[PDB]
Subunit: 333 residues, 4 copies
Amino acid sequence: TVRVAINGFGRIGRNVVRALYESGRRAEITVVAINELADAAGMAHLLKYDTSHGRFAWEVRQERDQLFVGDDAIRVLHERSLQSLPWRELGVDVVLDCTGVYGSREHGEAHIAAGAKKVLFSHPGSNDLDATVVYGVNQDQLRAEHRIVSNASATTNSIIPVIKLLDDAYGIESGTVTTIHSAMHDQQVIDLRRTRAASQSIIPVDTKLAAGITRFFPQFNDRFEAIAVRVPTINVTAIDLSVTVKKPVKANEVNLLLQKAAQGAFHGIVDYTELPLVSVDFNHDPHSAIVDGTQTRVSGAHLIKTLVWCDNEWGFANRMLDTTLAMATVAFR
Amino acid sequence: TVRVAINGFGRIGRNVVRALYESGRRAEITVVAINELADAAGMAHLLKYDTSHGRFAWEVRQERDQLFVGDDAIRVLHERSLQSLPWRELGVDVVLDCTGVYGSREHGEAHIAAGAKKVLFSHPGSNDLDATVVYGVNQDQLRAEHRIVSNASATTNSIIPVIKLLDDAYGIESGTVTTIHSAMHDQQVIDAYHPDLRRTRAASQSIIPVDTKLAAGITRFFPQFNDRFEAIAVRVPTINVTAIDLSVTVKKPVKANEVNLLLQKAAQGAFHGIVDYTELPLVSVDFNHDPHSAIVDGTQTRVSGAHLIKTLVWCDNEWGFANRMLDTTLAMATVAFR
Amino acid sequence: TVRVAINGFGRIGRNVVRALYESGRRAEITVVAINELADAAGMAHLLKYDTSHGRFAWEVRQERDQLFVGDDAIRVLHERSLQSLPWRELGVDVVLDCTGVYGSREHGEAHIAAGAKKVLFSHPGSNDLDATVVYGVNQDQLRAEHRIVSNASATTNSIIPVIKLLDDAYGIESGTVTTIHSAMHDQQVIDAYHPDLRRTRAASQSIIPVDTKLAAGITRFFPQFNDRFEAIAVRVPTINVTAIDLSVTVKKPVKANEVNLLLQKAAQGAFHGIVDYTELPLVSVDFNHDPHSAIVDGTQTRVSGAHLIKTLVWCDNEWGFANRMLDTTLAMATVAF
Amino acid sequence: TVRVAINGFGRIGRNVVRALYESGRRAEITVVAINELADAAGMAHLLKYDTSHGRFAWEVRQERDQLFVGDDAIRVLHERSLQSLPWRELGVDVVLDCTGVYGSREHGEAHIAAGAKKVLFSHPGSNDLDATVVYGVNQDQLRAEHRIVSNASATTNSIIPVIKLLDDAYGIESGTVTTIHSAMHVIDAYHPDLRRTRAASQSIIPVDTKLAAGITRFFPQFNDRFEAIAVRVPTINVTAIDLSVTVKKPVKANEVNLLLQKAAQGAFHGIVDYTELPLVSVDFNHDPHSAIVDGTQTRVSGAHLIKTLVWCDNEWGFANRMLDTTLAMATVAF
Ligand SMILES: [Cl-]
Ligand SMILES: [Cl-]
Ligand SMILES: [Cl-]
């Protein structure tokens, strides 16, 4: 198995661990250690119980410096600084850094200096990492020397594959995006709105989505913008993409294109549906994106609107494991 | 004063009465009757207490067949058939039909046959009426002969003036809109089948897509948008403030700060009291009980390239609309003397 | 196999079908027909997709007048009139009436005249029925001649076992109870006015008082408590999972840790799988899809003086009760034969 | 006027300013300074917008080290320690410490050493203060020597006058209470209380409650005789308190109700209110009573076990009481 360590055991790190067992990736990957500055009993407790994701089905036990998931023993560490992480002794092939605080090149090099062979950050990080992977779009650009990698973000994983599809087919000239985030989620991007009363408002929030799009597709500088709101919902996100395109199109053609991708080159990554569903129906769906084809529109012939769903935690948590495996694989090429 | 009667005393009818008193339009308009199939004590109760609008500041009492707001006495009616409405006897100048159920020309004609000089429906209408008014945009098109009129909707009243401001300045070539509706006053959970399977699902938990015709409303008003406009919509569990997220391609090249200046000036000038503009860091409840049709949130404005403008527009989905009902009423009752 | 028909396929009827499959009770009970005044395709869709209970893990299909769960074919009926139901032709052992609309003795006799051998109601019904079963407490009172039975309600199933246990141990003198209900599907209004003015108010923003039948359920079940129990209740905007907050004065002096040990031992013994017990730091969602009738939250147990016991008890108000509908059905069809 | 300063401009400190102006107390009290470790432009924004009742109606501006409500200038400070508060130089009669974190006798003394004649804490604080006042119940007990005072808390101010009324009339043997809190309104971190991290918007969540300890400092006889639990639910603005007491006198519900109703018309006019209307929690939003008894929910089991449900705005009654108590403290100093 690929031996992995997780640095950080908040929502992302705990979901990565849940996704490892639930998805059967446990046949390819073993979590050997988890590092977090908190009580191990508290870690076992939050691993087991979750608002969004239900009770975890595997037996969870904790004793001394071990967390047990089924018969698997995972070492629990509490190290404040990266320099003293015992990654040589654990034989770590990839460290999945889920802290959301570490994310530079220097941080990745600290993990490597501590003995991890490779680092994968659960967010965009600084702009001098080795590679950013959006699984399904560019994982085949990974090289063995890409030792510090970003996995992008949930919302960029969600919409980049759709931007890619429509650009290749139709030629995007410009685009604009709105994300409707669930209110529970901790920090997609970085405020006098945050300190407000409970009013159950729709709350404008700062988005890094356009920066991530234009980092991925620098031919889209000066051509892409994004806004975002938080609403008091139950864990699924909607992304509302509007793009102008060179090639003339009708909605029915756009849906066909997206439906073929879902059933073909993007199977497991982009899904497509025309069922009368609501956001909660995508709760715990491992896809990066589910295109809601009842909502596709073309204004005239050149302004495409498409609405895409994602479980902002579960999709990204499974991508972290897909990317991990693609790194461990290229390492052995 | 213009003597008006309200048919229907749901949220829109109730808000219209509150807006009459809060706005100072009681100087020009008298509500002489309200018809609803409901207990009169319950009508008084709901007029007094509301989740979105708070306690009504006027004293509300109820006795016999009268509802009193302060010292005004309003007749309370409980007539099932439009033909039985005693509008001629009351001398009604305009009936504001706020039932959401009546909406055709023939419904308007029944109100007029019962003695109302003119009728204003609180939604776009069940068929084709004499006119549809977005106040601040085409009320100057009303003539005396327009007797059955629709006031459009909270949503079209909000976005149509913004589309006008942008189109007049920059030439809109195509557009697409998403409305984020508030689900506050719908059933929060539900145990019933409905032909639309989205409607059987708990509104309090999900972003839910809903059917929208906003795009046809829009194209009626802007024929030049050929078929160059589409729209979608979702309902979310939130308070009664709606967001409309409008994306249009324009001919003139433009920057975001220019668009915001255009809208900010239109709010001080020609759309004063109709369109407002803000640049503060606000959240949706900040617009609760605001009487404008549209509030442009300039912190949210974006231009992709020099031609694809995004604007986020807020409105209380009941309060601006209820105030627009009174404005249109007044414009109909005054052109009656041409 | 106990052959059963579901009358009504709203939330309770669909949850009863899901619980049949998820609990393994499919080894003793077969659903032969479901009757509902709604499209068969809509019935299939809603069995598959749910807000509180997520996606049904079984494959659901629908074709003509059949609904398929895995390889099981279930006949779909759309009858407005009870006496027109083909229960004789289908050989129905027990009808689970989950409409929430029927519930009188005469309604039960209508299902029987149509051919069902016995009827079980998914609510308290009239004061008229042959038996009201709180499974775990009085199913052994069932007899072959009980034909028309009520299963009580999710909240009476949840608090009656606890009340029994405290009464046997300490002797209850008086009691008062508050239900903190999650969003209530039967409190919805369509029109805009309702003779109950609380029902017109937006439910997401408020704690809303709501009429409760709980103390009447308690006194029906334990008549020695008439004029010694009262109940109030409120509605809060959570999607599922209800808290019952029970306060009782008792004769025997007692301490919180004793009351917890008693209730903890009951959960491990005579009430295993009916009443659970926890001292974990959990929130209401952690009980979602838990099949117990009751989970006592040991962290909230209080005794004031030596005589006034407060206990907070959770239940998934949908899932415990649906699992009990199947238990009581099985006990009904078994005492029979 | 009584010159007051506010220390800490979170929810309660902003409410105390709004309440000063809306209640007409501006007639007797002047807020002269506010201290907060936050930007002043931000403070003025939250004063204006964060109200639960529309935009605050007075004009709010901010410039230099000043915050203006209408024509009033209020000095703004950003001192990180009590020692260096310039109270003496401002002439402060009472500091309302609303930080929710200072609350011992030593903190009180530090405010007074800095110049405030008297201190009122907006929470129960230490058990070594000079007095705790539930206004409408024990303010006639304040004297000139009570300089460091707690005003108890919103819920405590809600249920204690009702506990007093029922005890005077029927003799409370023992009591149990449940508080149903609305949202104050999910930080992804670990806390020793593992409930803390859980999404508030989704659940009924048990919270650790200070209600019984507050009831039993106020009435020490109830000390092995009163308990409290509490949950938090995703609603807004208003809290419910569900009180159950065993009493010595036999009693009927309609009598309990008449008693509480008359108390609302008489000795507790303006403090406890009473209703039988079909109302919901949001109907008491911005209601300035410490308590509204919901008469429709009153019950008596077997003649000795009274249940009563009581509503309060989370903060608005309490903010108004901060001023009543402030006024009473500044009044017995002369
Ligand atoms: Cl649902
Ligand atoms: Cl309401
Ligand atoms: Cl959680």
